[PDB]
């Protein structure tokens, strides 16, 4: 039953899943290449993103000698998909990472997660991210390598639009214009304050405070939008707001500024409005929190002088097609130590898709609805719902999985 | 036999439950479209199907003029306003057929049905349609206007939910032209714009301020829709205000919305300057397809003199979204039915079927029963079997309509 | 029922793999033909169709003017250029309907006569409405007075299978100074040659006259509707002083009119008691030929300016050329042909055709990235099925042209039987 | 099991007859290939298989240079030179196997990617170890990250049986003042031709500059391993006197070196008010080829000795040129093209290359003396298996780049099965 080979042996190539999402569509098989250097901590993790609908594979990140991690860079597929379809579903993957330059281990887990709700992402302290025996793996040798293998989370799931480009001139050259993940959408509420009240001495150049921050996960477009009311006695105030997106690493990869110079006038609801648009192609690396920055400031103001206002509001952030499963959970990690500096980890993997041509080239691909298999379903269904019993991982010594082809190959 | 294949294979035998697993309790109906339209003076038009719209739109005619450009005639509905009655809304099965029934044989069609929505085709003239698609299955070519051509609506995905229809609320208000509705939402469609990136505006001064367009791009609407984002301008130069439009353009070029973002705002030196966009357009609204979308900035100096150079630079995104656009069916696909050579002042008729799995509104549900549908064992694997041998089969999204015609007494028999 | 079979018989079902030895990694696809051609004032004409060409081209309407002579009016192509996407192809199966569809305002008439050549178009003997009838012998080659409003359908019947993959004539990448600079990868396997002797030692001999004398040496019928070359050398001796010679080639095409034209020789100084040579290395690019060819004729113009008394023009002339016609001998590239000749229909009318063809094809570059290629269904019985009915072809009526109720029946009977 | 199967997937094991249709009597041999390649000091290269060539011409190494730019290593033949020996050829089967099999004195590392691209050498639109990646869609003709202690296996899969028998570019009898003279019959059939119009009605124009003016009027990329001729021919007009043309062909090889120059045109002056003929006949054979070319430029050097105030240089031009790569369309070739790309290899490594190749061949006459020839095996279904293995072939995973592990275990599930 091809279906089942495609999932259980990614890189046999793509099948169509035997659901009732019946859509015309074409299947292709995208292969992920890379050769990632160790830093000098001998330490890393790649974070990968299994069931995502599209070209986006995963993240490496270096461990420093300090504690903190550092983005490296993205994993993606060969070619861009957006670049030559518009929606996407995803059907199989697998992916291999051991060393090719005896040093070091692997530690290996698939979290239910997005990746800014783990709580420990130390080499050991993933062991724990799940209770099921078969979603991690422990201290496999660097040299033998971990398989991932990305198992379902939902099926009859809907095409994803790919984020590609749609047709637009305009006077900047660097503008941009995509249709995105849409369906499904991811939506936080925050509630930065009710009634706060702050208060301060006068200091030339403003006070800064964080009002709040939070952890948020986004790869993709995103929005942000709601409203801050300000209730003042003081006359003269003015503030300054600003939103940042933070990666993984602790660095800031967006900032957009809410208020400038808004004044503040006394006795009246003073309304401070977030109306933000953050396109995927200013996301360098993924986003793990966000958190608010107000600057208070009194310009004919003394030492002395006190600042003080009061505030109200909630803001909701909107991840496009945020919800989807596979486009921020689940997460698979793959963490590595004492590997020596400089050495070598390779990635190498398959993605099989189900795709729908955008319009130039479906002048020239043809699409279909795909092979009827009458019992592909059900046996997928009792292949996963016996996944203790025959030892179906989501992380595997590479060593494990060969042997385990081998024993399918046979039936 | 199945009954649902019957239906899916032969819409105008009435609606059947479609056997997938969104077991909901609903009624069955068929609504019918009757148009008669006119041919224009180049004889030769194009007529837009949303084969799978979940609703009473089925689709828009166009004709072509002698300079070249199409211009709306209007959008073709099903009988009824489906909205007045029911609030939620499944397409079961649909076929439309297109021939000509006047003389004031002359003319022929050429008919495809494209994956994309009706913006995203790189060409819609009569003989470049036939190339939209690669199946062989999904175009037709040079058919008789006489003989006429049949339009059959194919399934993009079953196991769909059922879609608001776009209903009115219960409200009440000062202004008599109030609308209120609830809207097609599930499964919007998602368009950034990123208008500029550090973007140098620079222009010598002149009474009544400088216009320029920022950027265009297209994108599909049938239905309600909103516009979110933000502009940031800077600037050196004292004492310059902004004026700033949307447009929400149609096929034929012409504008079918425009919306204030800016008027008289000033821009202050050293500082952020935002321009909102809290833009929300309803459906009624909407006059004709939108395909295309631009944005106009004026800057001009009130207390300026010839001589005094304008300028300031921009950043910023918008967030276009489509309520339900991307709902299959809904935006995609698109069957188009061309037709050139034909008489000026003929009759190019329309008719045709559309079947539903509805929910009726609070009035009707005090006399309109719902069920959750016949079970039919094997009707999905039948429906599953059909479509994968669709080659073999010629199971086509447009016929040459004797074509259709003999296809039907083959399945009847 | 096998699919080829299917395809074979029923083009606008869509295509199938040809059940061959021909065993490449390819991918299967239709393209549509769609024309609406109009009728001149003698409400005659005639459409040539390439039934087997190996790609876009599948023919060209002339209408036929009150002098007698044809005038191009133009090629007929398929919806896409295949070269834009594809560098290889070979032809699966075609069929196109030729029918009116049209009475113009201010009475329907006229009828068809349609015939399969085994040659290519030069080689027709005689193109009127009435002369194709006896352009083949099998009575399943041609088809009679059929009512214009009624039609014909032109079926492809094979020419030949385990037929090599074709270039496509597909762009390659280059970059140059001219704008207008082409470059393409041309269909070649199995070239078609011509030799023509133009000259054995022939006197030519002529009175002075400003300007010179002009001959033309010969003329040719040769069939042409992509690149050739034409090569080759002609040796001139001579007597007399201060000659010199131009000397000019024309591709004419089957309207008469000159589709081409290469100067081989200008301004060609002949020197007495030596052997004068004049080489020719032409290369005719497909973009240059406008419609087909048909006929390829040299001119030589003498003249003396020189000057002496009781001397004439002469020179005594020897030469031979070889015109290649790149995949030229191709099964399906020139022959055979198809002639779809029509008479009496009303003035303005639309002639319409429509029809359908499928391929075998390997992608470009590009496309190959996104484009999976197979070697295609495997079916036991398929080629001997269809040699079975091919051989059964006179007792089963497949014709290669139909009057198209004809054809709609047949294809009944065959989705029953 | 059907020897050929079993030659055909398991190419050491020795040849096989093809069960097709090409009945010629033949005689059936392997020739191994061996190479201890060296990794230069970037640890990356590139070799470049042409897995259906039909003769010894196996493959070229190259390795990637800091700057970026690829560097002709050397070629990669059979263990002798078939020509000398045999006339006619067709392959059979092939396989080849990359490793490394070493660590040099002062760690072991690398990578290989390879893929099997359906195109020729300069069809590629990206050559970069990562790029290779998406030069095809199928899934079983790319491989990706293999270990190059590992290995990987090139397994050469049919583009097309019922091929003909090649001619080898064999040594012919001859004769010659030059010691350096060279003859040989080619392999032709199936020539390839590419058609370049360089100009039409082309404006050139400019000031005088002592020595001239030099314009390369394009650059496209072709493809060339064995003989090819270049003809055509330019055409020059010009209002100014005294100028004179020098035009250059150039064959570039994949690593951007020039391979071949001919001059076509030398110190030709041109003539006002007449058509200034520049033909080309350029035949560059095999043993002038050094490595694989991969593109063709012409240059044109214009010289205004003359002198004339207010005068510049200028004149128009038109021209056509068909390049003919001899038997350059015989599948196998030029196409496909089987690309093993390693990186991050220790510099100073030996990556080492180890295949068989089977042929059917006719030997030449001095061999034919006491080498008996015969039609071959009679397998009835042998070709009916080969076409549904083929069929099946994602189903079973044949692949044409393996990790040489899995091709190891393949090897046993079939010597099982
Ligand atoms: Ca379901």
Same mark, same amino acid.
Request: proline letters at 5%.
């Given at each position: 039953?091809?279906?089942?080979?495609?999932?259980?042996?990614?890189?046999?190539?793509?099948?169509?899943?035997?659901?009732?999402?019946?859509?015309?569509?074409?299947?292709?098989?995208?292969?992920?290449?890379?050769?990632?250097?160790?830093?000098?901590?001998?330490?890393?993790?790649?974070?990968?993103?299994?069931?995502?609908?599209?070209?986006?594979?995963?993240?490496?990140?270096?461990?420093?000698?300090?504690?903190?991690?550092?983005?490296?860079?993205?994993?993606?597929?060969?070619?861009?998909?957006?670049?030559?379809?518009?929606?996407?579903?995803?059907?199989?993957?697998?992916?291999?990472?051991?060393?090719?330059?005896?040093?070091?281990?692997?530690?290996?887990?698939?979290?239910?997660?997005?990746?800014?709700?783990?709580?420990?992402?130390?080499?050991?302290?993933?062991?724990?991210?799940?209770?099921?025996?078969?979603?991690?793996?422990?201290?496999?040798?660097?040299?033998?390598?971990?398989?991932?293998?990305?198992?379902?989370?939902?099926?009859?799931?809907?095409?994803?639009?790919?984020?590609?480009?749609?047709?637009?001139?305009?006077?900047?050259?660097?503008?941009?214009?995509?249709?995105?993940?849409?369906?499904?959408?991811?939506?936080?509420?925050?509630?930065?304050?009710?009634?706060?009240?702050?208060?301060?001495?006068?200091?030339?150049?403003?006070?800064?405070?964080?009002?709040?921050?939070?952890?948020?996960?986004?790869?993709?477009?995103?929005?942000?939008?709601?409203?801050?009311?300000?209730?003042?006695?003081?006359?003269?105030?003015?503030?300054?707001?600003?939103?940042?997106?933070?990666?993984?690493?602790?660095?800031?990869?967006?900032?957009?500024?809410?208020?400038?110079?808004?004044?503040?006038?006394?006795?009246?609801?003073?309304?401070?409005?977030?109306?933000?648009?953050?396109?995927?192609?200013?996301?360098?690396?993924?986003?793990?929190?966000?958190?608010?920055?107000?600057?208070?400031?009194?310009?004919?103001?003394?030492?002395?002088?006190?600042?003080?206002?009061?505030?109200?509001?909630?803001?909701? *952030? !909107?991840?496009? &097609?945020?919800?989807? +499963? /596979? %486009?921020?959970?689940?997460?698979? #990690?793959?963490?590595? $130590? =004492?590997?020596?500096?400089?050495?070598?980890?390779?990635?190498?993997?398959?993605?099989?898709?189900?795709?729908?041509?955008?319009?130039?080239?479906?002048?020239?691909? *043809? !699409?279909?609805? &795909?092979?009827?298999? +009458? /019992? %592909?379903?059900?046996?997928?269904? #009792?292949?996963?719902? $016996? =996944?203790?019993?025959?030892?179906?991982?989501?992380?595997?010594?590479?060593?494990?999985?060969?042997?385990?082809?081998?024993?399918?190959?046979?039936?």
């Amino acid at each position: 039953v091809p279906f089942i080979r495609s999932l259980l042996m990614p890189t046999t190539g793509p099948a169509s899943i035997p659901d009732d999402t019946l859509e015309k569509h074409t299947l292709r098989s995208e292969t992920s290449t890379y050769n990632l250097t160790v830093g000098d901590t001998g330490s890393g993790l790649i974070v990968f993103f299994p069931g995502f609908p599209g070209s986006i594979v995963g993240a490496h990140y270096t461990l420093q000698s300090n504690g903190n991690y550092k983005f490296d860079q993205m994993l993606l597929t060969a070619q861009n998909l957006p670049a030559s379809y518009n929606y996407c579903r995803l059907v199989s993957r697998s992916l291999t990472v051991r060393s090719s330059t005896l040093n070091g281990t692997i530690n290996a887990v698939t979290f239910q997660g997005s990746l800014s709700e783990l709580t420990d992402v130390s080499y050991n302290g993933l062991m724990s991210a799940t209770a099921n025996i078969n979603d991690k793996i422990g201290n496999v040798l660097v040299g033998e390598g971990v398989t991932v293998l990305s198992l379902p989370t939902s099926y009859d799931l809907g095409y994803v639009r790919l984020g590609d480009p749609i047709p637009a001139i305009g006077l900047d050259p660097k503008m941009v214009a995509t249709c995105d993940s849409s369906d499904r959408p991811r939506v936080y509420t925050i509630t930065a304050a009710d009634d706060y009240q702050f208060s301060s001495q006068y200091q030339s150049g403003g006070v800064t405070i964080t009002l709040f921050s939070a952890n948020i996960d986004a790869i993709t477009s995103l929005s942000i939008g709601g409203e801050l009311v300000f209730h003042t006695s003081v006359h003269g105030l003015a503030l300054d707001a600003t939103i940042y997106l933070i990666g993984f690493d602790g660095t800031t990869v967006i900032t957009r500024a809410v208020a400038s110079d808004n004044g503040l006038t006394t006795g009246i609801d003073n309304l401070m409005p977030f109306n933000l648009v953050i396109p995927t192609n200013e996301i360098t690396q993924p986003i793990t929190s966000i958190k608010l920055e107000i600057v208070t400031s009194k310009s004919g103001g003394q030492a002395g002088d006190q600042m003080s206002w009061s505030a109200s509001g909630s803001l909701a *952030v !909107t991840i496009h &097609g945020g919800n989807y +499963p /596979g %486009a921020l959970r689940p997460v698979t #990690l793959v963490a590595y $130590e =004492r590997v020596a500096t400089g050495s070598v980890v390779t990635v190498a993997g398959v993605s099989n898709f189900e795709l729908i041509p955008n319009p130039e080239l479906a002048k020239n691909l *043809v !699409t279909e609805y &795909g092979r009827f298999d +009458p /019992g %592909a379903m059900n046996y997928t269904k #009792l292949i996963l719902s $016996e =996944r203790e019993r025959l030892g179906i991982k989501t992380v595997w010594p590479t060593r494990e999985y060969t042997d385990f082809r081998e024993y399918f190959m046979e039936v």
